[PDB]
Design a protein around this ligand. Structure first.
Ligand SMILES: [Hg+2]
Ligand SMILES: [Zn+2]
Length: 258
């Protein structure tokens, strides 16, 4: 009886196995744009993904992850509210059963159809495992998805989902360029938070982009065909794999723009 997104093992139940769920810096949160503080000292984000090397795509029962080779500084994030270099290890999405919900973070209570999370770890800690033991060990770049025009750069991902329909399945996924998933502007909001799935560790510096990317109804529909279940068990569609907004507590959201 492990964690999930169902009525008996959903987000409201996570605190029993992961007490940190009721912690001081949990994510996601609602971004109140009028209370966010413009910080002139925040430097522009530096995204260097030209040398990225994707390796595999897999269904882990909660979402699907596209993993990258992080043995060298091939795809890194620098600048912004960050000190040092952060290496990209994987990206995944959270989505809903309908176009009106799916994102984890909200903007003035508005929910988007999905949210993309590019996960990076601080290279000064040597590896991901060590990074998750530090308060500044991870940096997650969050991008909202709205339904409208199709995103060409996302198609290669949607076309392989059929091969990893059930939990545990994985497939080679090389030469995928994540630059095709980025919006025009890099304006962002940032705040200290946590991973949005167990273990819910509080080691994340969140960088949420203000500009969402558009994807087509057909593309998001393919996400909804995945299964939470594995093997040959009762089919349970992988939808609404998002966590509700958490208390901001003693935290301030900063904006790179005004
Ligand atoms: Hg941590
Ligand atoms: Zn996530």
């Amino acid at each position: 009886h492990h964690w999930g997104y169902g009525k008996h093992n959903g987000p409201e139940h996570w605190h029993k196995d992961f007490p940190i769920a009721k912690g001081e810096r949990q994510s996601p949160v609602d971004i109140d744009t009028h209370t966010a503080k413009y910080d002139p000292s925040l430097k522009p984000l530096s995204v260097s993904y030209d040398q990225a090397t994707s390796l595999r795509i897999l269904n882990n029962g909660a979402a699907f992850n596209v993993e990258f080779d992080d043995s060298q500084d091939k795809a890194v994030l620098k600048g912004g509210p960050l000190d040092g270099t952060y290496r990209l290890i994987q990206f995944h999405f959270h989505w809903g059963s309908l176009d009106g919900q799916g994102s984890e973070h909200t903007v003035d209570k508005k929910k988007y159809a999905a949210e993309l999370h590019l996960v990076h770890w601080n290279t000064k800690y040597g590896d991901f495992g060590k990074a998750v033991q530090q308060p500044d060990g991870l940096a997650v770049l969050g991008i909202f998805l709205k339904v409208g025009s199709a995103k060409p750069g996302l198609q290669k991902v949607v076309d392989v989902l059929d091969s990893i329909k059930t939990k545990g399945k994985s497939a080679d996924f090389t030469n995928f360029d994540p630059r095709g998933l980025l919006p025009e502007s890099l304006d962002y909001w940032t705040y200290p938070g946590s991973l949005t799935t167990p273990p819910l560790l509080e080691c994340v510096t969140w960088i949420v982009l203000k500009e969402p990317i558009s994807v087509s109804s057909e593309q998001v529909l393919k996400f909804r065909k995945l299964n939470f279940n594995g093997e040959g068990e009762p089919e349970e569609l992988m939808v609404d794999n998002w966590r509700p907004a958490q208390p901001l507590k003693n935290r301030q959201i900063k904006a790179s723009f005004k």
